[PDB]
Design a protein around this nucleic acid. Sequence first.
RNA 1: AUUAAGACAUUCGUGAGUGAUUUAUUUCCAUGAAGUGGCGU
Length: 279
Amino acid sequence: MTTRMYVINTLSNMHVGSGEVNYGVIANLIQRDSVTNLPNINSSGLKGAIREYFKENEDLVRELFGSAPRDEKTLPGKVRFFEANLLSMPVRSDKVPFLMAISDEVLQELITKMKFFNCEEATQYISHLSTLLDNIKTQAQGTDFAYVFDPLLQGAIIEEVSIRATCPSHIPLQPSLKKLLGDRLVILSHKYFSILSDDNHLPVLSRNNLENGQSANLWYEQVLPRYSRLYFMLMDGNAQSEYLKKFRDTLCTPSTIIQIGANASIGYGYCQISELSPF
RNA sequence: AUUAAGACAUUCGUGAGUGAUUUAUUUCCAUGAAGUGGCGU
């Protein structure tokens, strides 16, 4: 009942600002992971968003999240939040509106993270993901690859990285892996996913401020594509079981929508938190 | 047995709030639905 894995499914474009002064075209850059350079959410922003959703229940917030910043007495937080690392990203396609993109290195990182943290349902997922990765490496033979598993998606083109996907027939994708990584899943090489997720290929949006019809300002914003999947780990310390159960029920309720990041008033960063389903 | 032993620079903290890729710009300028009759001396 500890250190379980939660999956974040974005319902809209997400912008979590990095706060670094970029003097190039994109003034507002999104938050990226320190080691893998993949888009991510810091555990600080995740905790802030989840606290903002739960702020109505004062006792639950005090028990699980800690104390208010201007409370006279300080109370340490009992639940440990972890940074949300990117799992799947949507990529444009011709046969289907989009494909779910994941790389072999992303799968390796996920397997290693699950092994280190020992999630609640980690064993079966680790075994099956290792089998899938071994089959993928056997079929690829060290070459660049783009593998889809639905036979109808053969020859689907990734628009940014103009590579058509091939279907390895003997590599099976289990339904639980489909639920986790997403439907219409394409597994690419590390270089293809790095090119897809870099600053030049992530969606960049142009915005302006108008004063009586004439443009006062202009800036470029980059965002995480809608339907992107991110995963984070949640460890509960010496937290009370009743408050933990309330938190997990509310967080994983299908009617619960959490806003993470910037631009809340223009519908940015709205997502659903799902728990790791038993295999 | 020695101005000694014990002590995490830690707790709480969303890079967030406001922002229309908009304003100005004629698919327009030139151009003949015209030219010629023929044979029967």
